Amino acid sequence: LVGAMDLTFVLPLGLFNPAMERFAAHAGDLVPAPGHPEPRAFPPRQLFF
Amino acid sequence: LVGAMDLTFVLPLGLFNPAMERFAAHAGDLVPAPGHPEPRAFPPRQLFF
Amino acid sequence: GLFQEAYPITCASDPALLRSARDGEAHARETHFTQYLIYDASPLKGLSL
After folding, report:
1. Which of B26, B29, B36 to mutate to test the interface with A (most CBs of A within 10 A)?
2. DSSP C20
3. Between B and C, how many CB-CB pairs are < 8 A?
């Protein structure tokens, strides 16, 4: 009475935001230091889990 | 039965945060008086505890 | 092998998104300028490990 549940997992990697969801939900948030590019504006390749 | 224990510790100095993590959570915060240099974007040289 | 299905987990494109999607999705930053986030939908959601 012990055993294994095997579950495969799916992670989309390096995809891209569709045309509707490109907002920020508030004005000032996720803001860089003022001489910095704000790298969240380009297509992401990283992934975190 | 009144005993003893030792622990070892790790503390970082002088490191620099990676570029994806250089953000601030909000825009308007940790701002000095309006004629002052914003030293928070500098290399950290201290560590407090 | 019965549903021919799989499940996501908690994953995102930024550590900034991974931080605010912690304690659950009560305030999940699901999307941002190009970035995105997937909250875990699974038989394993709600559990610790």
Report:
1. B26
2. H
3. 7
Of residues C2, C8, B37, the one with CA closest to residue A34: B37
Alpha-carbon distance of B32 to C3, in angstroms, equals: 58
Contact criterion met (CB < 8 Å) for B41 and A30: no
Taking the C-alpha atoms of residue A14 and residue B47, their distance in angstroms, rounded to an integer, is 36
**Quoted resolution (Å):** 4.5
What residues of chain A lie within 8 A of the CB of C39, using their CB?
A: none
Please, which experimental method was used?
cryo-EM
Is the distance from CB of C31 to CB of C1 less than 8 angstroms?
Answer: no
Cα gap A16→A38, rounded to integer Å: 17
Cβ-based neighbours of A28, under 8 Å, separated by 6 or more: B26, B27, B28
**Residue from B48, C40, C36, C2 nearest A22 by CA:** C36
